[PDB]
Amino acid sequence: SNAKGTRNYHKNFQVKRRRRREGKTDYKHRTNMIRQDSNSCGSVKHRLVVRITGSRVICQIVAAYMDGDRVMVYADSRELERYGINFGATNYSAAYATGFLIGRRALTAMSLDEVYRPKEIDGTYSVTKDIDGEKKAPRVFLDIGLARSTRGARVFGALKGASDAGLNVPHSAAKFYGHKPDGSFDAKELHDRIFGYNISEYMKQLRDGDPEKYKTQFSSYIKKGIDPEEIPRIYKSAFDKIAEDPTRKKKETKDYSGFKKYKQARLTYEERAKRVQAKLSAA
Amino acid sequence: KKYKIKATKGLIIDCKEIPEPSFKEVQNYGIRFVYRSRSGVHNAYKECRAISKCWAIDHVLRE
Amino acid sequence: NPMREISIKKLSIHICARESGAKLDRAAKVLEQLTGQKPVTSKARMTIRNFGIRRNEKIAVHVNVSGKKAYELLNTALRVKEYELKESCFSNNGCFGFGIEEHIDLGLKYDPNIGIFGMDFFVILARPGDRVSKRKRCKSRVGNKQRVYAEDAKKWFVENFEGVLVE
Amino acid sequence: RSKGYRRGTRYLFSQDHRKHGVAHVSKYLEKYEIGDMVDILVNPAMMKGMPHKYYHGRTGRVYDVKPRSLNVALYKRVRGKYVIKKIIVRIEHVRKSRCSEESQKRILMAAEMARDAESRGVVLAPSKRKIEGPRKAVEVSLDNNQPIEVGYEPHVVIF
RNA sequence: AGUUGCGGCCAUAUCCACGGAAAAGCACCGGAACUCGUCAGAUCUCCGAAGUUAAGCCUGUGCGAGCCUGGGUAGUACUGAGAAGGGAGACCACUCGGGAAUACCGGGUGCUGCAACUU
RNA sequence: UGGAGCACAAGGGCACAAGCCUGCUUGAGACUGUUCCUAUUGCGGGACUGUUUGGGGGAAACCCUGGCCUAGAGAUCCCA
RNA sequence: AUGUUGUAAAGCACUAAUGCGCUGCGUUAAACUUUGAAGAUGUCUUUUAAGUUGUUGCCAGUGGGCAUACUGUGGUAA
């Protein structure tokens, strides 16, 4: 063996790919994901990339080329604030609404919104069919990256919202909230989680009994004026504005080129020669 | 062998032949040279008498 | 600079009831009653005759506890040693430990059906932000300005118990 | 010396020093069509679909595309005549051939000015290449660039 | 001008030491009624927004280790095509062609694509 | 950075794996065609497609017709 | 124009060897390779030079070789 600090350790090292050394890509998963037939020659696959950061939920539809992916549609959880929602992104009801807004926003670009109306919000497991006489609904596959696939995770809430919008994404009814181990499915427990029947129930519980805990757990909820009883109606009022105008508000501000003042410049070649020689002379 | 210019990538610009003298007269000459042996390369000096520079080289080779 | 406080990361306790069988479940009920959690058993990697162990059977039991539960368990065991530890028990990277000889000094009354067992305490300190090397996405390395060291861990010890550093 | 399928391939089927690992993603995004030229080049980390060692380093022409595979046609010599062979190879042991880059950008510009010549009426097809000829002429000058005076230079030894 | 999401080529990008950082982001960070998972809410899963730039990420520095590219080594070693050359042999020479490699010296230290956001 | 393992000889290969632990399973299914070693040529051993009132694993993309790859192989006539 | 290769030589980066000095100096490889020729070998273009074959019928002999220039293997050697 040659140990880590030595010369022969570095001469023989092979580096991994850059996205694996950062810990952002799984490359066996990515190869199984983008594979398609060498025959087809019809069009490239579309995946639905769902990533949840520390403060928002991101959704975007991607296609793979030989010098980098390309984004076709994009939606964010911070765009929901123009529809009345500002009380807490990155929860289960925000992921649903972010997926719902990207399905409608994608069908509009294809002119398939008069067709493929939004399904009823509180229905059962209903993967959508293709109506005779016109184009198939666009097909998309779910790509959850390095997040674990657990029954009841927020990433399968964004999958459910893109089906209700009228996209064609395959799945089974597991990983939802009504699923029973035998194989049955109760479609009301998934309706009680889409709306804040979980949040409102929790605020009322710890407000009556310990308002000292209620003031830290739901601090910004109180200062924004959200009281628990009206929560399941604010969501219901936002799922009908999305189904009537899901489009970019079209602002096109100009460039931030004055920010070039904040880069540290490199010593050129002669500030280093002077810096070396002076350090030897006085030594 | 000193620079690395070879014949297939070189150019000859001029080539002149020096003619023999017209008047003949015996003088003394000295000839620097190297030569190849069965086992190496060597130096030598070798004076002589001749009637020109090319007649003096013919006489040293003859010896 | 509230992001630079040292604290108890994890506490480890285990007993080696050497050959498995009946002597295990006496110890396995001690760790449960002392702490409150079910312990875990351990197997032997190879077979040794000079010690008398095979290659697949139980030797010891241990348990890991955290939170404020572990802070007061550490207080009771230290008093048994008069709140003093050898100076050479601290390691390069902010760890130290010690062994308690007889089970009945900390708590649990005799019950002569069990016996008297020995313990082994090990402690790990840390500052906040240690998660960046344990998580799943974007796993990384901590950085030297964090990273409790030996003398940083000694003077943490003479501030929470008023101990004394022998030798 | 024995005659198994992977006979005598210790150096031929090996990775090349800090180039280990499986195929990269851009190797699955290339688009192949009937009539293309391709190079066969084995990756020893992928076990499936690989051809016999005879064909490593040969260029062929595509005549069919399957969902995971290609069919390639090429020539093999067998003591006195040539024979056509049909190879089945997976997409991971193949790359596009650059063997026609010179000939295509030359035939492109030819038809380019042909259209730009019929626009003006004056056209002409013959544009053959020519080999490099004897030598043109030179006008060497010595106003600068003085000669250097070289010669035979006696022989020296150091030990 | 940059950062973030998803990438292509996969060290000029890695490793070790010190430092910097406006706005956003990315984080670290406060918890356990519900979902999910443990000896352990450390990791994983759900709900949050009091605090902090200390770390991670990004940027500078170093006659830094490695890596990349040049010079020297050198028309040297080896070698394709020839001829009734020398030598007891081992092998050496000549004519027309092609041509390397450590030790040593110099200079460099990621380049790019689609999208969103920041005075 | 693999300096270990991966039934057996040796070589090649491999790190969020082909190694270790763990869950469920019987693709070690029924048929059908093109091609390589490989030729003037049989047997054999591999690779790749199609058709199914067909399976298994997985949320899904996707993979699976024995063993990580190169060895483990038997005509005419007769019988079951 | 654009691909393939791991020998000679050289070298110590891996496997296996080899003397000293207490960082350097010294010696190795058919079943070692960080490097790496001369030479070979694929494809495109006569829209490059120079030159000027396709399909099939009926049939014989032969299946002990030897020498040499350069180049290997076994053998003290022939």
Question: Can you put this structure into words, describing what you see?
Answer:
This is part of a larger assembly, with chains A (283 residues), B (63 residues), C (167 residues) and D (159 residues). Chain A has 283 residues and is an alpha+beta fold. Chain A contains eleven helices and four strands, in the order H-H-H-E-E-E-H-E-H-H-H-H-H-H-H. In chain A, strand 1 and strand 2 form a beta hairpin. Chain B is built from one helix and four strands. A two-stranded antiparallel ribbon of chain B has the order 1-4. In chain B, strands 2-3 form a two-stranded antiparallel ribbon. In chain B, strand 2 (33-37) and strand 3 (40-44) form a beta hairpin. Chain B is flat. Chain B starts with 26 loop residues before the first strand and ends with a helix. By secondary structure, chain C is of the alpha+beta class. Chain C is 21% helix and 22% strand. Chain C is built from three helices and seven strands, in the order E-H-E-E-H-E-E-E-H-E. Chain C has a five-stranded antiparallel β-sheet, with helices on one face. Chain C has a two-stranded parallel sheet with strand order 4-7. The longest helix of chain D has 18 residues, at 101-118. In chain D, 11% of the residues lie in helices and 20% in strands. Chain D has one helix spanning 101-118, and strands spanning 37-40, 59-65, 69-77, 82-90, 94-96. Chain D is of the alpha+beta class and 159 residues long. Chains in contact: A-C, A-D, B-D. Chain A binds chain D through residues 14, 17, 27, 30-31, 34-35, 37-39, 41, 64-66, and chain D through 18-20, 24-26, 28-32, 65-70, 91. Chain A binds three RNA strands through helix 1, helix 2, helix 3, strand 1 and strand 2. Chain C: One of its GO terms (cellular component) is ribosome. Chain C: GO terms for molecular function: rRNA binding; structural constituent of ribosome. Chain C: Component of the large ribosomal subunit.
